[PDB]
């Protein structure tokens, strides 16, 4: 058998359970209760509650009619030319009786992967049959969908979840799962989440099944990313020779690529509150220079070594 992942076991079934973007969710709750659901294009970063919001809104709107009132299409299904002109038009033209205010919902999940030609053929399908059916869009990039489609929909841009929102939902999960935890353990999970509740649950679930008590040491053993404090010590070492030793033994010899080292270094530098806001921009600039060198193709150990030397030169010259 298997154990249900906490990503799916604690999936919100009601729109109220979703945390983050409190303004957008509150209006969505009013729409579900009242009716007349407008065309929306929910956009934002992955794992912030875009697909969940659409599914919760559809369930709270149709209810018992959700089985035959929703035509959900994702990237796995075919969303080509023939599907738009035949399958979607047939669903829109289908005569389904619903309580007043309720409307059929055509959920086109991951619309950024849809071709431009399919989107163009979908223009008049949503406009002509909006009396009986409605369209809901969820995507990671809002610019992938063509402009004329965006002119017929109320674009909702979901934002990154705040640290309070992610922590609040994690508290409910551990309370309902009887999970031993500490303050430093949860801070590491929020650090690795980066406003991604899906990644916060996965890190929390793996910590429990991996090493029991959720400590920061236990958390950072399973993310298999460069340790922020190891990178911070390398970026803030008083001696350049010590920092070079840290990079070689703990980052380069452990197989961490130059992209992950730079990404972790920029992440740690962004939160270095000890240093001044002027020097912080300079150290970010050197990381930006190093990241550019890797993208052209020069991503050897010397480029990372020079980045440490330039950063340590900034600290000593200050």
């Amino acid at each position: 058998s298997l154990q249900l992942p906490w990503v799916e076991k604690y999936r919100p079934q009601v729109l109220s359970d979703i945390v983050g973007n409190k303004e957008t969710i509150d209006r969505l709750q009013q729409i579900a209760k009242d009716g007349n659901m407008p065309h929306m294009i929910i956009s934002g970063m992955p794992g912030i509650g875009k697909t969940t919001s659409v599914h919760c809104l559809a369930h709270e709107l149709l209810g018992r009619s959700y089985a035959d009132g929703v035509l959900e299409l994702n990237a796995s299904d075919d969303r080509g030319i023939d599907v738009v002109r035949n399958q979607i038009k047939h669903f829109a033209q289908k005569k389904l009786h619903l309580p007043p205010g309720k409307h059929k919902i055509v959920i086109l999940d991951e619309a950024d992967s849809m071709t431009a030609g399919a989107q163009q053929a979908l223009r008049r399908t949503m406009e002509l049959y909006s009396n009986s059916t409605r369209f809901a869009f969820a995507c990671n990039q809002s610019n992938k969908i063509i402009e004329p489609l965006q002119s017929r929909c109320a674009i909702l841009r979901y934002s990154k979840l705040s640290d309070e929102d992610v922590l609040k939902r994690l508290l409910q999960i551990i309370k309902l799962e009887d999970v031993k935890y500490t303050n430093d353990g949860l801070e590491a999970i929020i650090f690795t989440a980066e406003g991604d509740m899906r990644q916060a649950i996965n890190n929390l679930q793996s910590t429990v099944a991996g090493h029991g008590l959720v400590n920061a040491d236990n958390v950072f053993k399973i993310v298999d990313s460069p340790h922020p404090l190891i990178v911070k010590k390398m970026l803030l070492a008083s001696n350049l020779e010590d920092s070079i030793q840290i990079l070689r033994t703990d980052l380069w010899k452990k197989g961490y690529s130059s992209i992950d080292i730079v990404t972790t270094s920029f992440r740690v530098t962004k939160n270095l509150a000890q240093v001044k806001e002027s020097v912080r921009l300079e150290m970010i600039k050197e990381i930006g220079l190093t990241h550019m060198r890797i993208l052209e193709g020069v991503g050897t150990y010397l480029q990372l070594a020079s980045m440490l030397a330039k950063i340590h030169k900034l600290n000593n010259k200050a």
């Binding site: 080509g80 030319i81 008049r124 929909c153 801070e187 992209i259 730079v262 509150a273």
Partner: protein, 468 residues
Amino acid sequence: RSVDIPLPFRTIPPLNHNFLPSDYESLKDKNSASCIPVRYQAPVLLGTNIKRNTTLTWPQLFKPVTLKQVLIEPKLKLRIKNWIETSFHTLEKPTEFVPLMILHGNSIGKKTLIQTIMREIAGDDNSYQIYEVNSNMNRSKKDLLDILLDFTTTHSDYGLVLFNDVDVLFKEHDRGYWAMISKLCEFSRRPLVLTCKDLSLVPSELIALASEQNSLFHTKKISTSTVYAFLTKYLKSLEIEVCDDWLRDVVKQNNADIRKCLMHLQFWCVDTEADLISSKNRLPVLTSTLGSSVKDISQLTDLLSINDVIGQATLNRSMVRQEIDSTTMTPEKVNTFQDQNLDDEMKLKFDYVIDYKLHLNDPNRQPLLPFELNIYQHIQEQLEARYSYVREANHRLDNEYLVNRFKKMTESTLNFLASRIENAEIDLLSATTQQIKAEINPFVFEIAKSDANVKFNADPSIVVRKWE
């Protein structure tokens, strides 16, 4: 071997990483004031109206009931009204009158205008039957010429055929589409309308007949002030009170689109006790002070210049491979359709939208995905949050600007030098653009300036204003 570098060997000390939980508290994300919500006032609503409790969307709830309510300029409203009226009276007379109107332009109500006019032509809802041909169906000669001919040949009644989105055509699904229009131009006694956003997709033949018959109308976009005024009247009908700052904001981001704003208003004008969308960013403790020392600015200007070099490089180098669209026309797809061995079953598998511009995509230099690391934006956002003129420089001179300026600028030069007492058109374009930008055109202004100074050549005022 026997090579010993004259430097002492190093005895690296063991490096130990014993991190206290106190150090893990430093991993807390520091407060970033760059992000700045504004939290506009919640929408104060009053009364209970039927216009608010409706089963129809707001853009179609405010469907125009007459010609006056449409936001197209009344100059072109009268011309289109005349032609349709004269068309129905002409096509009732046995017959030079080609029933084809092209209503191009970036306007909004290009389809509702036809419907609202047709309502006034007959006066009864059942009298007018407009057959609308959209891109949601297969607009091929084999699939539509049979139905359309019977609709436009037999024989108060007022029938019109509308061809919406005529610029969106597919290579195989809409085969023989333009031939069908030419067939409809001859054997039909009912008016035909084809709306579009770009006239280049329409063949040059059909442009000629419309221009000769004065049935080629260009509906340009309308000012945002008129759209802002119309929204105020609409929101008054449902008894909605809205702060004028947010209503001005909505029109700006939606590019003065009546349909986009009404969709935008519908979501955000519900009765909830929550603040509105931030949209416009308030000043995040914006202090663009002089800085006193030029040395401090000499560091910021260098930082801005370096960051632009980083932004130029990183922005178009993505690690994750992105695919090309199967519907945009590409050089590989153009030659794929040129083979006669390609059968029907696979031509449909990869069908492209007909376009006049080849889509050239680089499989190695592609735009960065949102989840990829981007250090250019973080530096730009931080710098824009503390120095105002950086944000002004973000949208000062884009690529679209200084190119249409140069095109208009050369046209004045090509008109001034052609007015002396075809050769100038090609010989200037033969000269390199850099020489035109810095040598020829700056000197043509000198010649033109001296012409009007004494008040030889002619027409010197046009060049002067272009080189203000």
